[PDB]
Structure 1
Amino acid sequence: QYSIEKLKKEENSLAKDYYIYRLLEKNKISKKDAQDLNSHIFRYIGKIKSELEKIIPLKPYINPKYAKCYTYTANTILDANLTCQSVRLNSLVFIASLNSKDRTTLAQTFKNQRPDLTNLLLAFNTSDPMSYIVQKEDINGFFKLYNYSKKYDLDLNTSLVNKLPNHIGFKDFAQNIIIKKENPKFRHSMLEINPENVSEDSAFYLGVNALTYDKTELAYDFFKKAAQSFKSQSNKDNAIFWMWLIKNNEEDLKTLSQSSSLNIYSLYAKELTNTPFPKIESLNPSKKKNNFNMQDPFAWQKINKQIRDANASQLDVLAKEFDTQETLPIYAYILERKNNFKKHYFIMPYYDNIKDYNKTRQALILAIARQESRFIPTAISVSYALGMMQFMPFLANHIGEKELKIPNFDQDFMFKPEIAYYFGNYHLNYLESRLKSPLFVAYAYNGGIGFTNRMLARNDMFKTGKFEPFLSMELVPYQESRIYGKKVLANYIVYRHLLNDSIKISDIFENLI
């Protein structure tokens, strides 16, 4: 427990944020203590911001140069000077609120200097502003209208759709409409995007899009462009896997099987080609401990910052300092940076707490902890999930107080490895009993069993099909859970291998359908 006075002495960090949030939620921050407090908050977002704003609303913040502009309304905007008129017309809701005669007037006013404003004003004088903006091929207007309302939907011709990728909004547009299976005319139109005009994630999602319309040759061309342009080897491998699945070129599979990235795709390719399992590093420090406190959340925030700012030389000093059994998770974390992310570290710390579970359970626990925290006992997420297994306070308290009735339980007990692994086992029993597959369990661990149940109830998810279950894995509608599932599944395969309880990843894939 930390008073606001003592917290204010600590460096700004997620740990300090968490402990400030704990005071706010227990009503221990007075209006007077609240006055300076946002200079003490490292990430002023979500619940900490809503809680603080209940004590001290934000009057902030309109830019003082344009103050006067915000004194007009739709009824008086024709009395405003030209700068004021153009500032207020940045808002499409403001434009929508205008009467049509004033939209006509303002459109004429702005036609020479701001034809973008003209196009939007006249668009809103029609019953379908999107159709007007599309006829003009006003790309900036298109994205403004999309951000205003996701309900507009229209066919887009080859020329227009090939202009969209140059706008910063394209990537989120494409991803959202493909994954959410919305805006079907937009989605169908995006089949005519030239792969030459897209790259990376956008190219990849356009591949996925093409597969949903069974346009396999277009899909291949998008995935090939993605494989060529993606920065990360793990993403390139995902793209190459699709190239292989669609066109069956055995050079694509061979390239995938020789990847330096360990991921589900490279593991699968290795299995299909009878390639040996990738080499896993063995870390076995003989030193037992050092002076570092693995149970101090503030100390972790500080050493993490140091490690991530350390030059090649400082990483070697830190490596030596943390080369002990007690600080093994910090050691592996340092080595991962020091070796430029080329070696595979799959540690098993605090193993005494799980050695009596069966090996398949051990592997799933380890797989989850590796992705959740990298085994850092005092890990804290941006949403204040806690410890090695990244329990949200709600769940920690439900399990620790309601279910297990641990005397004097506090959510900070999640920072103790014994508790993290015990609670993790407890919750994984609940999930696995309902879902079975380690991939589904992973999705429910990160995203909730409600989300997972709803996804699996759909007719179009994890059912039989030409490109299943891989296609479904690309369409998991929450990006954090989609990524999380792929990573945890790879880790699970590795840990099962390391525990002498190997499973073929092909058997996992068969059990998904």
Structure 2
Amino acid sequence: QYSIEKLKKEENSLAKDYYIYRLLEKNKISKKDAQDLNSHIFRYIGKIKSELEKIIPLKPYINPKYAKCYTYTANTILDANLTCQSVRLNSLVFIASLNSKDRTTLAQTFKNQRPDLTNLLLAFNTSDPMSYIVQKEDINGFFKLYNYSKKYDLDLNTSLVNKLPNHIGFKDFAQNIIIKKENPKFRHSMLEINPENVSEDSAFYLGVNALTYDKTELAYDFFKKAAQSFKSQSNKDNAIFWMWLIKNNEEDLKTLSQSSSLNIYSLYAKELTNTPFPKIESLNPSKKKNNFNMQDPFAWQKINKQIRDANASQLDVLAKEFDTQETLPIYAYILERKNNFKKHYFIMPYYDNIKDYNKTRQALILAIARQESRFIPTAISVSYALGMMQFMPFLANHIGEKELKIPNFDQDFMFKPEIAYYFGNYHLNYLESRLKSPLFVAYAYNGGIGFTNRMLARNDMFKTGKFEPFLSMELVPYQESRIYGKKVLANYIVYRHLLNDSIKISDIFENLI
């Protein structure tokens, strides 16, 4: 392990963060060590921030211009200057805490210059502030109230709902209430949003919303708008798939089957149309090694940064240097960026560690590794998941120390490919024995078996229905897991194909119900 003094000499990165976090959790960072340490942290968010703050709390920040404004309370705010009054009224909790006579006074003070504040003040003088703000069609107020409390729910008329998409909060609002199946009056109201007023993710979610109310014509119009506006081909394909499922225009399915993006939708469309499986690149570097240490996490952070900030020209230089067997995962990574995501790279590095598993298991392992890490041995996530299979420390230590009783086990062994694949196999066995489907296994790998079980216990998820299992896949209640499953499923299909163990993706879909 590295001392704090040694780490401080490394460039700031997630790897340096991880090793600082390891010192913090072992109580090895003194109050003195901690003094300059925020400047040594690359991403000062989450557990590293809360551990550091147990040693040195942060006070900040109050803009010194307004410090005096924060010496008033709800009982003394009428003594504050007008600037201080309006700063403190940025907080809806602060407004809620005022007495109603003071809300009336302040509403009058601000009626001319700040009718937004007046609207919220008089709204909080009623038993339903959301109803008041909706009657005013105060869009900024609406979103401030929703952020304050998700519990408000009311029917919204055609005029009001068509104004909501112009506000930056709309996309997360729509996503959250549709996926969480919350705020039903708001959800029903959003059926009247004109597709002309939405785009991209928002249009797509509004298509999903319309399907849940069996408004299939409105759903088609939203999905069509999403397909026309999405920046990424994979998302466009997801929208075209819905266009096809709803109205069965064979030009939509034809366009989907010819996509440059390899995803479950394009793979499915290819299968339905007797279109050949997409071309998978074959990478076989003749040069066997270079000088790069594939086991140094710091070296990976540094080369990743360079690769991501390389121009079109510098990528060709890095491609050549890393065109070796030993650095195959870095090579494929460089090519994927360098060919602008047009070529399909599905490598199988360190294959000797999995070649004795059955091919279906090989493909599942490889499918997970590809999405988790792109096979980078020293991969570290923002939550400090580790190595090719991206194990969290807690589970790594549980398996390595308690279950397998590996002598001298340390969580950093997860950076060794033999260990990653072996532990991945071990955990995938647990999950698959309980869940069966590779899609459900992927949900549970990323999101946990508890979340997956709770989702599958629901009456409205992965049951029979007109648009199942595709609808359920859109309603997986955690965005990261919803995305992850779709990607890992595609990878799985590809690797099964590459291992001469093909399965029709239609069989996978049938088995979800």
- Give TM-score, length-normalised by structure 2: 1.00
Paired with 1:232 and 1:138, the residues of 2 have a C-alpha distance of: 33
Post-superposition offset of 1:127:
0.2
User: Which 4+ stretches in 1 moved above 6 angstroms?
Assistant: none
Q: Partner of 1:221: helix, strand, or coil?
A: helix
Post-superposition offset of 1:166:
0.1
Paired with 1:152 and 1:451, the residues of 2 have a C-alpha distance of: 26
Paired with 1:159 and 1:300, the residues of 2 have a C-alpha distance of: 53
Post-superposition offset of 1:134:
0.2
Q: Partner of 1:345: helix, strand, or coil?
A: coil
2:150 is matched with which residue?
A: 150
2:458 is matched with which residue?
A: 458
The yes-or-no answer on 1:244 pairing with 2:244 is: yes
Superimposed CA distance per residue, residues 218-261 of structure 1 (whole angstroms, 9 cap, x where no aligned partner): 00000000000000000000000000000000000000000000
Superimposed CA distance per residue, residues 389-436 of structure 1 (whole angstroms, 9 cap, x where no aligned partner): 000000000000000000000000000000000000000000000000
Which ranges of structure 1 fall in alignment gaps of 5 or more residues? none
Paired with 1:121 and 1:115, the residues of 2 have a C-alpha distance of: 10
Superimposed CA distance per residue, residues 463-484 of structure 1 (whole angstroms, 9 cap, x where no aligned partner): 0000000000000000000000
Post-superposition offset of 1:60:
1.1
Paired with 1:435 and 1:417, the residues of 2 have a C-alpha distance of: 26
Which ranges of structure 2 fall in alignment gaps of 5 or more residues? none
Post-superposition offset of 1:440:
0.1
Post-superposition offset of 1:59:
1.1
Post-superposition offset of 1:61:
1.0
Q: Partner of 1:407: helix, strand, or coil?
A: coil
Q: Partner of 1:117: helix, strand, or coil?
A: helix
Q: Partner of 1:127: helix, strand, or coil?
A: coil
Paired with 1:59 and 1:170, the residues of 2 have a C-alpha distance of: 33
Paired with 1:484 and 1:118, the residues of 2 have a C-alpha distance of: 45
2:10 is matched with which residue?
A: 10
Paired with 2:168 and 2:487, the residues of 1 have a C-alpha distance of: 28
Matches for 1:452-491 after TM superposition, within 5 Å: 452-491=452-491
Q: Partner of 2:2: helix, strand, or coil?
A: coil
Paired with 2:445 and 2:341, the residues of 1 have a C-alpha distance of: 26
- For the aligned residue pairs, the C-alpha RMSD in angstroms reads 0.2
Paired with 1:479 and 1:189, the residues of 2 have a C-alpha distance of: 23
2:29 is matched with which residue?
A: 29
Superimposed CA distance per residue, residues 324-372 of structure 1 (whole angstroms, 9 cap, x where no aligned partner): 0000000000000111110000000000000000000000000000000
Paired with 1:386 and 1:52, the residues of 2 have a C-alpha distance of: 21
Paired with 2:458 and 2:62, the residues of 1 have a C-alpha distance of: 45
Paired with 1:331 and 1:94, the residues of 2 have a C-alpha distance of: 55
Paired with 2:417 and 2:102, the residues of 1 have a C-alpha distance of: 66
Matches for 1:100-499 after TM superposition, within 5 Å: 100-499=100-499
Post-superposition offset of 1:159:
0.1
- Give TM-score, length-normalised by structure 1: 1.00
Paired with 1:157 and 1:257, the residues of 2 have a C-alpha distance of: 40
Q: Partner of 1:372: helix, strand, or coil?
A: helix
Post-superposition offset of 1:55:
0.1
Paired with 2:502 and 2:337, the residues of 1 have a C-alpha distance of: 28
Paired with 2:287 and 2:404, the residues of 1 have a C-alpha distance of: 36
Superimposed CA distance per residue, residues 108-141 of structure 1 (whole angstroms, 9 cap, x where no aligned partner): 0000000000000000000000000000000000
Paired with 1:339 and 1:478, the residues of 2 have a C-alpha distance of: 31
Post-superposition offset of 1:105:
0.2
Superimposed CA distance per residue, residues 73-100 of structure 1 (whole angstroms, 9 cap, x where no aligned partner): 0000000000000000000000000000
Paired with 1:47 and 1:146, the residues of 2 have a C-alpha distance of: 28
Superimposed CA distance per residue, residues 277-317 of structure 1 (whole angstroms, 9 cap, x where no aligned partner): 00000000011100000000000000000000001111011
Post-superposition offset of 1:318:
0.2
Post-superposition offset of 1:15:
0.1
Paired with 2:486 and 2:361, the residues of 1 have a C-alpha distance of: 18
Q: How many corresponding residue pairs?
A: 513
Q: Partner of 1:62: helix, strand, or coil?
A: coil
Paired with 1:190 and 1:210, the residues of 2 have a C-alpha distance of: 8
Paired with 1:72 and 1:312, the residues of 2 have a C-alpha distance of: 56
Paired with 2:63 and 2:50, the residues of 1 have a C-alpha distance of: 23
Q: Partner of 1:467: helix, strand, or coil?
A: coil
Paired with 1:379 and 1:244, the residues of 2 have a C-alpha distance of: 39
Q: Partner of 2:32: helix, strand, or coil?
A: helix
Superimposed CA distance per residue, residues 28-77 of structure 1 (whole angstroms, 9 cap, x where no aligned partner): 00000000000000000000000000000001111110000000000000
Paired with 1:399 and 1:287, the residues of 2 have a C-alpha distance of: 36
Superimposed CA distance per residue, residues 458-511 of structure 1 (whole angstroms, 9 cap, x where no aligned partner): 000000000000000000000000000000000000000000000000000000
